[PDB]
Ligand binder design. Structure first.
Ligand code: ADP
Ligand code: ADP
Ligand code: MG
Ligand code: MG
Lengths: 226, 227
């Protein structure tokens, strides 16, 4: 196989998707073939599509998914509102397994935090990471409360021997300020900060996003991912 | 000894202080002697004082502080900014142990979430709960992300064998709405919801705060906390 990376986060809306796109772009620019799998998409009525965002910002074509729920809720509540079950655990695991190949960086996005229900019954992105032997990139804020949430998310990963690939700060404010700076220094002491995406980067055009993305990660750490 | 509860949260500003004041009020109204305890307090340059809010809202007089910092930051950062160290682990334990008394319920409020550093080095409210053999009451939101943060907090408690005494929704809107209704329903499938304090409980005067508090918790649960 190749390298599988779940991109989780301390919660909903911390920037997992733009981080997938940003790492996908950096990898592709280093000559690494990239796949992204978002098994369950929600909020489709209002037009949410995290896979399309990655395809537009990073140019990935291998973009796999299984389920789309109209309501902008967590997967399990959106499926309960729609009256239709989430996908099954095997379905997601096999989909990621079949995307995987040597020379390929395969990224996997769930929804919200590490423990939100992703399949029936009650199976999480952690269970998926364990099943496909993926390591975990953890996207965090630099804002109030981030150390507590980052530490809780790391404990849950380590509890099932899901390896921490590093942290990414999903949105790095400009100018930093005293809180963001202070918080970044402290996260830097509990795990490697692989990147800090500048605030608003999800709305750049693909040229700027690629340039921004290649400056955001360390060229050698990306190269060695596969 | 008596009963020691740590009152933690899924994060900062979820209402741990108002829950302390509310559980204190309800326990007092059951005739239970209450002490409340706040080892680390930040933001004194802004007038933040959680022990004082608990005293104001619930009439508690047995209020024990220890470390105080001017800046409203994480304790580590606030103490750094003030050129001080966090207290040691044994000083937080001494503060709590000195308060413990048979027939007494001693509430210990941390700062922010469960794994926030409260004592050098990297010592948390969970470590402190272990040292004093306290259960943990988890204050949560009914907002976006609560399930994940609550499940992560509950799992970290069980990982150190710290018993969980339940959830309190620190701020509960009237009327709930679809999001808060959905979350309270889901939180209650994973633990006991001991209370859901009506939003704005901190603006109730002494008399109404005590009525709210007596109705917010199940008296039989409150009374069964303390032998
Ligand atoms: N646990 C959850 N509870 C409620 N809504 C959620 C949850 N997880 C995802 N969502 C919905 O999915 C949208 C995108 O979330 P997510 O992809 O996790 O953000 P990001 O990719 O920026 O980290 C959110 O705006 C929200 O509408
Ligand atoms: N980890 C932290 N990071 C930043 N600020 C904190 C932290 N912990 C406590 N504070 C400060 O203490 C104040 C109240 O926090 P807390 O007592 O945890 O809230 P509540 O009692 O409402 O749950 C906040 O306004 C914040 O400034
Ligand atoms: Mg996303
Ligand atoms: Mg407080």
């Amino acid at each position: 196989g190749g390298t599988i990376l779940v991109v989780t986060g301390t919660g909903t809306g911390v920037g997992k998707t733009v981080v997938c796109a940003a790492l996908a772009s950096a990898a592709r620019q280093a000559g690494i073939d990239v796949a992204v799998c978002k098994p369950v998409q929600t909020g489709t009525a209002r037009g949410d599509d995290d896979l399309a965002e990655v395809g537009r910002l990073a140019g990935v074509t291998q973009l796999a998914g299984l389920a789309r729920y109209p309501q902008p809720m967590a997967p399990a509540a959106a499926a309960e509102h729609a009256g239709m079950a989430l996908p099954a655990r095997d379905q997601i695991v096999r989909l990621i397994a079949d995307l995987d190949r040597p020379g390929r960086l395969t990224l996997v996005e769930g929804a919200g935090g590490l423990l939100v229900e992703l399949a029936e019954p009650g199976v999480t992105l952690r269970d998926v990471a364990v099943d496909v032997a993926a390591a975990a990139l953890v996207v965090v804020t630099a804002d109030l409360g981030t150390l507590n949430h980052t530490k809780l998310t790391l404990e849950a990963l380590a509890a099932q021997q899901v390896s921490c690939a590093g942290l990414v700060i999903g949105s790095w404010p400009d100018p930093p300020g005293l809180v963001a700076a202070s918080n970044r220094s402290a996260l830097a002491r509990i795990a490697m900060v692989r990147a800090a995406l500048p605030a608003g980067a999800a709305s750049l055009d693909a040229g700027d996003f690629a340039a921004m993305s290649a400056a955001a990660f360390d060229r050698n750490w990306v190269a060695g991912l596969v």
